[PDB]
Amino acid sequence: IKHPIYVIQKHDASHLHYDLRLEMGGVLKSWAVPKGPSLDPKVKRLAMPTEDHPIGYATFEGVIPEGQYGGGTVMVWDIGTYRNLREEKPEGSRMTIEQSYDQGKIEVFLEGKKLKGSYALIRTGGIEKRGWLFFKMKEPHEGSYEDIEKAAPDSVLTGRTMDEIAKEG
Ligand SMILES: [Mg+2]
């Protein structure tokens, strides 16, 4: 519905993992994030690049046959839009989202229902599976951080659990 799309799908495949996707250059650039996003700016999550997906896949919630790529249950875990923070810079520090991605340094403000705030995706040269680091960007906070995966486990589109999606198709 709104653009540029940000979506995370929770994906019960071989193992449970999250797929993060951001719209750019007409597709959803995608990463698999084994343990999902963290709200804590000290937590580094690893983000393994996966295939580009079509824009309309952002609201796919249902079941892919076991044995296929993407096989298992897919939940639309969070969805919204994002803003590219790297456009908010003095002249000659500005970077479009595509230039950001090409450089291996993406800083965005995610406008989701579960995640809302500044997050970084940083490309690495030597983490296994062409790893990137995915983390909440540092800002003032007092207190411990919610475990968003525990606190908000269900579909942002339908409110269903993973097992309800698997049973219903
Ligand atoms: Mg997958």
Numbering used by the authors: 30 to 198
Text taken from the publication that reported this structure:
The AP–NHEJ repair complex is primarily composed of a Ku homodimer, DNA ligase (Lig), DNA polymerase (Pol) and a phosphoesterase (PE). Studies on NHEJ repair in Mtu and the archaeon Methanocella paludicola (Mpa) demonstrated that both species possess equivalent core AP–NHEJ components, with orthologous proteins possessing near identical substrate specificities. We discovered that Pol has DNA strand displacement activity during RNA synthesis and that PE resects excessive incorporation to promote efficient break ligation. In this current study, we sought to extend our understanding of AP–NHEJ by comparing crystal structures of the archaeal (Mpa) Pol and PE with those of the established bacterial (M. tuberculosis and P. aeruginosa) DSB repair complexes.
We previously reported that the M. paludicola phosphoesterase (Mpa PE), which is operonic with an NHEJ RNA/DNA primase–polymerase and ligase, is a functional component of the archaeal NHEJ repair apparatus. To understand more about the molecular mechanism of these atypical nucleases, we elucidated the crystal structure of Mpa PE at a resolution of 1.79 Å. A ribbon diagram of the PE protein shows a hydrophobic core formed of a β-barrel super secondary structure, composed of nine anti-parallel strands. The β-barrel is surrounded by four α-helices and a 310 helix, as observed in a prokaryotic PE structure. The exterior of the β-barrel provides a cavity for the active site, which is enclosed by the 310 helix and a surface loop. A surface representation of Mpa PE is shown in Figure 1B and C, in which vanadate and magnesium ions can be observed occupying a cleft. Since vanadate is a structural analogue for phosphate, we infer that the vanadate ion is occupying the position of the scissile phosphate, positioned in between the six key catalytic residues: H40, H46, D48, R50, H82 and Y86. We predict that this cleft is a DNA binding channel. Analysis of the crystal structure of Mpa PE suggested that the conserved histidine residue (H82) may be one of the key residues in positioning the scissile phosphate in the active site.
